[PDB]
Design a protein around this ligand. Sequence first.
Ligand code: MG
Ligand code: MG
Length: 45
Amino acid sequence: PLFEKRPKNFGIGQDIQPKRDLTRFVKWPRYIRLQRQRAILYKRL
RNA sequence: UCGCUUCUGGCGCCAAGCGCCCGGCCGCGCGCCGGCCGGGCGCGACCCGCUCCGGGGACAGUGCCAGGUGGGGAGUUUGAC
Ligand SMILES: [Mg+2]
Ligand SMILES: [Mg+2]
């Protein structure tokens, strides 16, 4: 009777975006960057 | 094309709405059910993946030598009768 949906729109310019996983874009520290690049060189070279 | 917002000196969030399931405390007892109370993949809010996004790039640039220029600067000299 009173219970209603009232949804959101995660467009552009419209309502604020939610919290999703941002693991790929973190500013990782030094000891982590270094080893990952170290492994990649064993595939490039 | 794209996560869809252009007539106006407005508002916009914190866990949203719900949507499917698991659980506890009281009446049912067939308990993973009815009153108070919670978790959950996260459904909504698609998956997978090896460099944060772009721009350059085996040249710039750094080290050591070789040659030219170089009163900006340094040292000095600028006869005797
Ligand atoms: Mg001089
Ligand atoms: Mg002198």
